[PDB]
């Protein structure tokens, strides 16, 4: 076993959810409070991965693009890995984006990290 062949196992982390349905989005982050984040991991051609957070009573969600071993969900900031991406705005307010959220990384969708 190598490094190589393969990329990383966010799979791993207790903030992924691997193969989420949309309805299953809603009523997850339904009765959680402002600050839970979740990454989803549904099968498209356009977008790989894709993200859902909770603020002011309300289940945004959030578009990731990945292409030539890069990634990013918008052209504010390019990261190489999805980690670098999720990592890097989980410390810093994504206001930077999202003029309307101005909100971080606090507590995941299973508990409390």
Not at 72 to 77: F, L, N, P, V
Not at 81 to 109: A, G, I, M, R
Request: with cysteine; charged share 30%; glycine share 2%.
């Amino acid at each position: 076993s190598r490094p190589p062949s393969r990329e990383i196992d966010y799979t791993a982390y207790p903030w992924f959810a691997g193969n989420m349905e949309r309805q299953q989005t809603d009523n997850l982050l339904k009765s959680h409070a402002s600050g839970t984040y979740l990454i989803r991991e549904r099968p498209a051609e356009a977008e790989r991965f894709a993200i859902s957070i909770k603020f002011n009573d309300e289940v945004k969600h959030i578009k990731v693009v990945e292409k030539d071993n890069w990634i990013h969900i918008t052209e504010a900031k390019k990261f190489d890995s999805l980690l670098e991406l999720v990592e890097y705005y989980q410390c810093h307010s994504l206001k930077e984006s999202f003029k309307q959220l101005d909100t971080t990384l606090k507590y995941p969708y299973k508990s409390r990290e």
